[PDB]
């Protein structure tokens, strides 16, 4: 009703960390909230159309799709339509980048060039395959999809030889797109799986010969109407389609797709070809309840947690909606609560523990703080832990290290020196970067709110001890 979203296109998700990341396409942002829906940070957070890198604030989309995130390094990988770019948001240095693309619809149908200088067409989807390191992009407006090397930031085709039409050959150059919306990678890192929107039909691409097979949809031939479209459960050649829009692979090797123009979720089996709708009645509109009576709009993107919570981007409704796959018959779907998202303009935040800390008494001093991990936790060296001091009215007391990154051991010490004789309230905000053995970047944000209040003259030089208890899978 009240939806402080305009037209969501794409999700993903990091199951890890706790974050939903949201293609709000129609206000030009990103926008990160935890997975029960309260905001985290948003970026671009002006709205308005545009270009520009930099900081969270500094920086600014045209109507961004696809979203891929990089576990290794935190970062999020945007498909920024609109601009014709590949933007990459770094969530370690809070700042975004363009990868690859310059702001104008290049009409290169080989490619081969690094950064900025590759320009692209309308890139819509992004899937990052995690081991090779590379981006694949659907570019819907050259019915093409793209490879993106993290390794020497080399953008060039991967297959699709420009022309429009839904044609499954052996090669790169002797396969066909048309308006591909969607990409996501089989577990096995062998296959990716398309959204050919105009064919209306779900494809599958082989990551090793460039070519392509056609799973189900977009076949005339045997539609009683040789209409290439429309919205019919079956297998292969049987089922019929409309403009779907996103495609997602889960864990258990189903693949799970939104048959947008139907207003539809259905599930398809890679091998039986088989498609049967889960959410959806057909017709246009806003209900939740019980799978098979509800109601989405367009719905056009996917993620998925690995306990088998599937969310959608409802696009035309707005809203987030969620299904929980594993209660089978009583299935239904439900809305999302999208907690403290406020939408843009030209302190606190939900994934952030507040930690009290007894009050500080002396008239100066030294405050040593360490923070430690549990076992078999390590910290990040490529990415180092970082804070920063405030006080409750600015110079009540004044702190030298206001910015400072943690030592290797978690340690800092911060000196103050209260001016009054009054009470303040410092907050030391710390991001702590961490990982297990695999490298996975944890992170946990720990606010301490120190209360100072002079009570001797006498220099004393207290100690924060914080253990840092990662999240529980």
């Not at 081969?112 to 692209?120: A, N």
């Not at 409750?392 to 009540?396: D, F, K, R």
């Given at each position: 009703?009240?939806?402080?979203?305009?037209?969501?296109?794409k999700?993903?998700?990091?199951?890890?960390?706790?974050?939903?990341?949201?293609?709000?396409?129609?206000?030009?942002?990103?926008i990160?909230?935890?997975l029960?829906?309260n905001?985290?940070?948003?970026?671009?957070?002006?709205?308005?159309?545009?270009?520009?890198?930099?900081?969270?604030?500094?920086?600014?989309?045209?109507?961004p799709?696809?979203?891929?995130?990089?576990?290794?390094?935190?970062?999020?990988?945007?498909?920024?339509?609109?601009?014709?770019a590949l933007?990459?948001?770094?969530?370690?240095?809070?700042?975004?980048?363009?990868?690859?693309?310059?702001?104008?619809?290049?009409?290169?149908?080989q490619?081969?060039?690094?950064?900025?200088?590759?320009?692209?067409?309308?890139?819509?989807?992004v899937?990052?395959?995690?081991?090779?390191?590379?981006?694949?992009?659907?570019?819907?407006?050259?019915?093409?999809?793209?490879?993106?090397?993290?390794?020497?930031?080399i953008?060039?085709?991967?297959?699709?030889?420009?022309?429009?039409?839904?044609?499954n050959?052996?090669?790169?150059?002797?396969?066909?797109?048309?308006?591909?919306?969607?990409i996501?990678?089989?577990?096995?890192?062998?296959?990716?799986?398309?959204?050919?929107?105009?064919?209306?039909?779900?494809?599958?691409?082989?990551?090793?010969?460039?070519?392509?097979?056609?799973?189900?949809?977009?076949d005339?031939?045997?539609s009683?109407?040789?209409?290439?479209f429309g919205?019919?459960?079956?297998?292969?050649?049987?089922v019929?389609l409309?403009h779907?829009?996103?495609?997602?692979?889960?864990?258990?090797?189903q693949?799970?797709?939104?048959?947008?123009?139907?207003?539809?979720i259905?599930?398809?089996?890679?091998?039986?070809?088989?498609?049967?709708?889960?959410?959806?009645?057909?017709?246009?509109?806003?209900?939740?309840?019980?799978?098979?009576?509800?109601?989405?709009?367009?719905?056009?993107?996917?993620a998925?947690?690995?306990n088998?919570?599937?969310?959608?981007?409802?696009?035309?409704?707005?809203?987030?909606?969620?299904?929980?796959l594993?209660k089978?018959?009583?299935?239904?779907?439900?809305?999302?609560e999208?907690?403290?998202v406020?939408?843009?303009?030209?302190?606190?935040?939900?994934?952030?523990?507040?930690?009290?800390?007894?009050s500080?008494?002396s008239?100066?001093?030294?405050?040593?703080?360490?923070?430690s991990?549990?076992?078999?936790?390590?910290?990040?060296?490529e990415?180092?832990?970082?804070?920063?001091?405030?006080v409750?009215?600015?110079?009540?007391v004044?702190?030298?290290?206001?910015?400072?990154?943690?030592?290797?051991?978690?340690?800092?010490?911060?000196?103050?020196?209260q001016?009054?004789?009054?009470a303040s309230?410092?907050?030391?905000?710390c991001?702590?970067?961490?990982?297990?053995?695999?490298?996975?970047?944890?992170?946990?944000?720990?606010?301490?709110?120190?209360?100072?209040?002079?009570?001797?003259?006498?220099?004393?030089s207290?100690?924060?001890?914080?253990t840092?208890?990662?999240?529980?899978?």
């Open positions: 009703a009240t939806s402080p979203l305009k037209f969501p296109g999700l993903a998700i990091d199951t890890l960390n706790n974050r939903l990341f949201i293609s709000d396409s129609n206000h030009n942002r990103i990160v909230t935890d029960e829906g905001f985290i940070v948003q970026i671009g957070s002006s709205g308005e159309e545009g270009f520009q890198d930099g900081s969270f604030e500094d920086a600014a989309f045209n109507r799709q696809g979203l891929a995130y990089n576990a290794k390094k935190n970062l999020l990988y945007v498909a920024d339509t609109e601009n014709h933007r990459e948001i770094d969530f370690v240095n809070e700042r975004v980048q363009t990868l690859a693309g310059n702001g104008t619809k290049g009409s290169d149908y490619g081969g060039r690094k950064g900025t200088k590759q320009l692209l067409n309308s890139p819509w989807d899937c990052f395959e995690p081991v090779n390191e590379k981006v694949y992009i659907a570019m819907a407006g050259q019915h093409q999809i793209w490879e993106y090397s993290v390794l020497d930031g953008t060039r085709v991967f297959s699709g030889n420009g022309y429009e039409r839904n044609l050959g052996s090669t790169p150059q002797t396969t066909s797109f048309a308006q591909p919306s969607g996501s990678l089989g577990p096995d890192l062998k296959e990716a799986y398309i959204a050919d929107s105009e064919s209306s039909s779900i494809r599958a691409l082989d990551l090793q010969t460039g070519g392509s097979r056609l799973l189900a949809g977009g005339p031939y045997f009683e109407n040789l209409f290439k919205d019919n459960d079956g297998v292969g050649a049987e019929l409309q779907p829009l996103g495609v997602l692979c889960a864990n258990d090797g693949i799970y797709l939104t048959d947008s123009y139907n207003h539809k259905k599930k398809l089996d890679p091998v039986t070809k088989r498609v049967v709708t889960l959410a959806g009645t057909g017709k246009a509109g806003f209900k939740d309840g019980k799978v098979k009576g509800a109601q989405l709009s367009k719905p056009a993107g996917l998925i947690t690995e088998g919570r599937l969310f959608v981007a409802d696009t035309n409704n707005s809203l987030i909606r969620y299904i929980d594993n089978g018959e009583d299935s239904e779907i439900l809305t999302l999208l907690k403290g406020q939408p843009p303009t030209p302190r606190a935040s939900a994934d952030t523990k507040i930690v009290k800390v007894d500080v008494t008239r100066e001093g030294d405050l040593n703080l360490k923070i991990l549990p076992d078999g936790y390590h910290f990040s060296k990415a180092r832990s970082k804070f920063v001091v405030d409750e009215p600015e110079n009540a004044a702190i030298d290290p206001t910015e400072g990154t943690l030592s290797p051991e978690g340690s800092t010490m911060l000196h103050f020196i001016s009054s004789t009054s309230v410092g907050k030391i905000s991001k702590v970067y961490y990982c297990k053995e695999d490298e996975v970047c944890l992170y946990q944000s720990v606010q301490f709110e120190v209360p100072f209040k002079v009570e001797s003259e006498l220099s004393a207290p100690t924060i001890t914080f840092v208890t990662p999240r529980a899978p």
